[PDB]
Amino acid sequence: SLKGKQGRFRQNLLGKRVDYSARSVIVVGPEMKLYECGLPKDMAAELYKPFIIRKLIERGIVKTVKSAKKIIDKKEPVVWDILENVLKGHPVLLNRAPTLHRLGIQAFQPKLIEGKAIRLHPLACTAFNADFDGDQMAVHLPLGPEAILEAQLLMLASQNILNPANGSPITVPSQDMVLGLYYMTKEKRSTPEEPVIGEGLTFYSSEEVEIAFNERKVALNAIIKVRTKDFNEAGELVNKIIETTVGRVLFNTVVPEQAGYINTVLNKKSLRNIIGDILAVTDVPTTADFLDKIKTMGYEFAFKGGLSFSLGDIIIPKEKHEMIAEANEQVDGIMMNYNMGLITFNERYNQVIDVWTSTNAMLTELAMKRIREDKQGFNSVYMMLDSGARGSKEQIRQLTGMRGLMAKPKKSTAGGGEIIENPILSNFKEGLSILEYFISTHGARKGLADTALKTADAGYLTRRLVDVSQDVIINTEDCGTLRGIEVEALKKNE
Amino acid sequence: KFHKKVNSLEDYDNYQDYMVGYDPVNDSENLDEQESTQKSFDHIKSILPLLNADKRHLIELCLKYGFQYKAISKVMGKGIHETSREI
Amino acid sequence: MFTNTIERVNFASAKNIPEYPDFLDIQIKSFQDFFQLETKSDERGNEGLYNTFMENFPITDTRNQFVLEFLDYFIDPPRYSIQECIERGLTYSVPLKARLKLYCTDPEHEDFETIVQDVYLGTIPYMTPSGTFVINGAERVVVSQLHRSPGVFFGQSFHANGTKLYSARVIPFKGSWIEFATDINGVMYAYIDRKKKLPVTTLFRAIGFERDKDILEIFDLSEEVKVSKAGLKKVLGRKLAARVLNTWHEDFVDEDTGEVVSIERNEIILDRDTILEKEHIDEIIDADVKTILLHKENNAQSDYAIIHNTLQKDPTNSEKEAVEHIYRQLRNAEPPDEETARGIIEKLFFSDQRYSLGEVGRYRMNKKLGLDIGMDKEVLTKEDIITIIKYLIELINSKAEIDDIDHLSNRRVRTVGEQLSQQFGVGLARMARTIRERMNVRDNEVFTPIDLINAKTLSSVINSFFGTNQLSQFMDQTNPLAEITHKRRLSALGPGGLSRERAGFEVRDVHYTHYGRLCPIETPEGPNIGLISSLSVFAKVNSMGFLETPYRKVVDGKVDVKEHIYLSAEEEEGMKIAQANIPLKDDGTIDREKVIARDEGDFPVVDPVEINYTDVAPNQIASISASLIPFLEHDDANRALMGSNMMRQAVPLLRPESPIVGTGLERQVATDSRVLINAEGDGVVEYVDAQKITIKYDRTEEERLVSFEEDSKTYELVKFRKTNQGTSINLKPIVRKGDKVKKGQVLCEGYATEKGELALGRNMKVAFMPWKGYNFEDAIVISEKVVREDIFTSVHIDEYALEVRDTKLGAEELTNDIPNVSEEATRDLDEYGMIRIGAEVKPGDILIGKITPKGESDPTPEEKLLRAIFGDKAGDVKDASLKASPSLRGVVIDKKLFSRSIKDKRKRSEDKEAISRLEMDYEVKFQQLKDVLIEKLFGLVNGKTSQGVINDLGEEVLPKGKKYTIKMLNAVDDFAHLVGGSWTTDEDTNALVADLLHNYKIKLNDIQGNLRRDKFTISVGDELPAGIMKLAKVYIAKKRKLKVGDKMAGRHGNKGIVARIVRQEDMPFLEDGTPVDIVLNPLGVPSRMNIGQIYETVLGWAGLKLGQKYGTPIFDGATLDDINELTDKAGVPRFGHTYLYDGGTGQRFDQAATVGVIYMLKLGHMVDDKMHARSIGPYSLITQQPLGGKAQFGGQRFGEMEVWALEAYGASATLREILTVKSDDVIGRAKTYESIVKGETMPEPGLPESFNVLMHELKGLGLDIRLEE
Amino acid sequence: QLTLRTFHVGGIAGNISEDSKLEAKFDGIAEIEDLRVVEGVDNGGGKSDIVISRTSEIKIVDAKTGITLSTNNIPYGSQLFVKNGEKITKGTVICQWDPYNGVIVSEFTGQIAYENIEQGMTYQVEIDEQTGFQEKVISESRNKRLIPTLLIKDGKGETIRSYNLPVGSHLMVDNGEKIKEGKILVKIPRKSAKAGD
């Protein structure tokens, strides 16, 4: 009874089922603030029941607890009137399991919403590892004033901007937000076939850029010159004329003036660095407001751009058949050389692997180039890939070029993993054949099995690490030590 | 047979989580019912001195030995029938 | 063409595809080879149950005075049909009775008369026509298992230091494992039932190989030379292959018994592997040995040197030395005599009692070892052992190959028939033991083969199998596809299989032998990945239990397109198999210079001359679910897996609609699911209504003469029936009065079907674009039109059952008058305290009111007086009513009460009168049936002469040679026992008479079952488990519309949660003003690589603009050019790239977006079932902590990781409240509730109760735990 | 993540090309420590220097400040193209070696002999079915006392040197064959870097 996961210690002493708790599916609230959450009316009414009872007795409506409970269960308008004010200043801890790091529990100030699903801020998703494909979250209600103060000053999501692992921001825009910001801050150059309105115009401030953009006289991606404040070589803010885009000006209307002027196309890496810099110069509240504003801007302009996924964006290179035929001819020549007796079996196998790898690399590069120069860099798939919103070179190559060479389904007893000589010449727009799909299912299932079976090891490692590091707490201020460690740059391959 | 008709709670996984449960509302309601019964009995005890002395002692004896018409009748002098009628 | 059917535009180009095997064959045909109700006596010789009857008979007592034999068995029609069994909660079973003959073999007791009798063996669960077992009112599936095939398995294991150890394991059909192994010392060894080790040569001697001459001649490694001076001098230097021993007899006299025992003692004069020298010649000569053995000069003997090493580790030298050593090693005691000493080995390895290989095992061992031992030997032999050791030695020299554990020829399928046969064998063995013991104890002549038999010992095993075995699983009853997948599942888990913890990666991967037999896509995504597989659409299981898939033979490059052959994993090895889509000339020759072949795990490119076989269909590798994903070739395998998993969780909808883009297998799934009413023959319907469909079947004149039933037949449609998962089965007629029908035609739609096609979702207009962040991270933005038009609305039925039993304190009653509840809460209850049909079950209402007799203690005088004066206000009854949880909102659709009739004296006399009247009525029916049968028979055989009719007792009821007239036709005592003989000289007349008698027997058995059921309901009443008086069931229907939080999914692995229900005017709309119905995130498409959903999006739109539905078979579907042609014909932009307008502003979006029609499903993960909130509620009585579960109104778990996060934040206060005052500080939580209500300060927390439980457990372990200040 | 990154790959083998050449990344003077070299013959028939020491360390040091800019280790059997004290520039190929299989370099000229090397006991011959190419791969022997040894002797038969051959190594020489200094005797097949684990 005392031993194991189900034992007394690990089931009833180190972790307990708790009161004033709830659980429900999570939907996305994009119009909320970083420190807000949407609680369904029934969930809030059940969680905050003693507080509603206190207000009901104080108001003189009832004098006993049972009558107040009956009134609450009848779902009267007075209950909601009380609960609206009861909610204020009383945050709730949202938790998504597994709780790998401390950001898995975060305090949110709740608001009453319709429906039965918790509304969660999108920027918190990365902290929770939470998507909206069926995920569920748990709500815990602090009771004492010290617990509420801890929630408001240590757990509030607007305070959990930085990752404790490395110090870099964790509340960074992702997916639609990054795609919209990238679309707004990317430059477009005027050509005779497609003119860009308002190119080369000089503006006295961001005010005139806003006026011209609102009157539809300068395009969002037009290259303009604007007089704004920027650092000089000495670090002082001085007015200067910068060549930028309209979208960059609009993005900088919400960037704090202490961070200077940002004149770069916004991807995930640049956004992370920019949020870190703004937090370095300003404080947390300013960074939170900046995050909310740029979230709204990115969502708005991704929505306005109509960015889709069409088969026209998956431009299969016209040269694919030529490269495949040339590689087939090379493989035929290598096969002849092995047949009549110049190269060994291993040499022929290695040469075939080499030629197919080179052909796959060239095809991937050509698909990269085509998708990059399509629509002057405004291909939606390319914007998703280059902004960091979603995608990679491998997936796009599987969509446009070829799936490449696949590892053989050899057992662990067999030494090493060979590569099938015939690669998957087809991609997912053309359509894999029966044999190619059967080949791919082995790798897919191996990856899924690794995912589903090799997180118990991660949990065990985390448990052992926590138990060996539990007692390490900053207890004093100075250990009066003359000892230390030498730190130098970390160089790999010089 | 009775001991072999009894299963083991270990046959249900995590039986301590979702089984063997109770609600304190039932306990509070039971104690409230007990208090109501006690108040009724106190009301009856307060009414008792207002009755005739013989009928008060009949009830007092009937509350410390208990509707024992025979032993009360020999104690009193009245018969079983008379004592029952007076009670 | 069938009436009311959709004619799809089919894009397949592959011809001559063989018809699918019946999708439920793996269940129906397996159970039909073990059981049936309508088999004739002559056909009952190869039916499986007969074999399990012979394997347990005869049963003879130890005194051999009595012998009991089995003759035949009979199966009676079920007492209750499937629908009634599902309504009451009983097991759909057939009663089995057997014919037994008990006789005496000892002539001394001549007063015992031989008896032939029928004995009720008991009720056996019976398989429904849909392939399921109705147990206790719930449908279950016996899942086919994948285990290790019987035979010989050769394997390797890497030892700790790195030296290989080889093994040869014999896997029997039933019994323990016989394992030979190689030790790190190079010594061969054998294991007996996983006990301690044993030298192989010791076993070889125990078999009967007395001397080392036989042992060395087994492998032919020694040369025999006669002992002589010149001969020994000629062979000087050679190593001795055998020990040179001196044989003499020593007389040992036992003091206890006085018998002189001559023990043959052998002294090792010369050891093995000793180089012969001149000195050893004199020793050999003095030993008086006749011949000696020397090592052969052949080099190959070195490869056999391990045997010699084993000989060096054998401490035995004679035939009986090894036997005695084996006895001492096994029974842990000295042998009593040599007879039992030999018998222990002869019974451990050569006896069928401890283990049997079976036909499959014998065949596999014969094929593997290259022997031809007769198939009648189910146990090992000495030749088998010799060949196994030979194969192990050949393996050790790196001259053979290791067997593959994951090969599909080495994985065998235990079907439902095999599992039921094994359980029946266990039960009948127990029954036979009981019969034998009963015959042992009985010496009185008054004992017959009925008193010998216990039905309980068989019913117990069968019910245990159907109730507690891992393979008797709750059926997935969400939609027809879920049933058809669960019935075709192959599980590697359960008894005799692997475990999740023990499951390595290798078994979970996809083997090259899974091609066409196991689906490489449809597997669970989690801890059960790879361990639970799905049968492929063309896969069968042969008689031996191995998966077989069909192919087309290719002889000299010419494909035989008219015939196909089912091949197993082993029959395919060494052959090159091509595809099905290979272009072919007019003569059948392959028209490709280079063809990619599938030879074992490799994919070579060879000429058509080298091709041996070809696939038969494009979708041979996929399961039913995978063969329902259009454009599967355009999806990643992971997304195909997820889509196959999600299509099985799609709830049936109130108004289902078949997809515009479908593969074309939906009709086959609907037909083979057998949930819809399939017409059994050609006919014209008579009358159609929401509850029934009656149709006149066309029957031939001969069939009408033989059949006792009217051509008309009525089918009752299933109306709002609860599944195992809560979903509803609602079937509606799609046939009008007057239409014509054919065999297999569906007369009804519903249960996620539409017009005979599977319909799991609805067609929705879709635009792929970001929408204000409301479709962020796999979220779904849907239009309010979906809620307005009831598109995604479903019905979910819940069943609430209350038992009222006989308790010691009194019989609990069902009444609407229950104490201390207002008159409003008992307004909707009837006399029996049961909610009315049509009421609204708001949370907290009483469904089935109940009163339980309260606990009157001793009636103290004070209580007596208080009741005497105040009254019986507190009457002895406590509320035991069923109350709805604060999440149940529904409408009562049906209520049922099942009761046992009260046994009274007047009721007993009334029951006797009623049973007499019913008996008279049933003899009237009997006589009417007999008269009809006699009239039909006289019509059949009028004017002919009888050739002899023999009954079951051998008496000729109808004398031969007499003409046929009415008089003796009505003089026949009974027809149900007329077995044997020929009625007439005409074969056709004889066949007609046999069929007529078979149908007469069927009808008579059915009417007898009806009479028995009427007797049971008059006497016992409603069937109900003992100890419970009444059962009250209330069925509540929940209309669940689509709401925010509900889960939706497509067929391509795309799933989401409805994040916002958006008004019509706020939706993106086209130039014509029509808004889209769903907005999906385009970002989900590239990374997840499920491009197929885009293709289906475009094609579907064309369909919606052309009134067309499409068939797009997987790997033989629509190319982009066909979609382009259809979109150009429908006035739809290519690739669905359209300019959209914002509904809230009106501005056209900057870029064009992908717009079309997508098939969207609604999964069974609804926010109604997921939301739960608790402030305070029930706690545990042990841990004093909140319970767990929405049904228990429990609280969420703040586990170890949450505590770690709280500690990392530094929240001492929040962690303290979570640990003490919110969970188990009994006083603290009440004081905190009071303080929150009254506004006061929070109480000081105290010691948690779980800590006190821990302390009490520690004290119960004898530890003095002291808390000190 | 160390177990979830495999899911996105989908089982496709990565194009991990092992660096077969080590080059100079900075301008300076190369100093080699613990360097032993022999004169061998490459595939082209010309003379080359082959390193026979496993502890060679090459340091590229700036000629102006004297601070060691870079440090690298010279693999055994690699072909050395830069001598000690020679000035080098950026991009110069310092050395090249076989990444797939390591090599054993003979340090003396003489005859090659086998010790405890027998067919079917310590090594096996793999023969191509089509071309008939034969490769002698050393396997694990049951008798641990039989250690496959290569003996390099002089013309008088005295064993100058003995080399231990590990399990799995391919024999590139024959018994009784005459060899020169710097010739590769036994090619040990290094475990090829598969798709990123």
Ligand SMILES: [Mg+2]
């Ligand atoms: Mg999720």
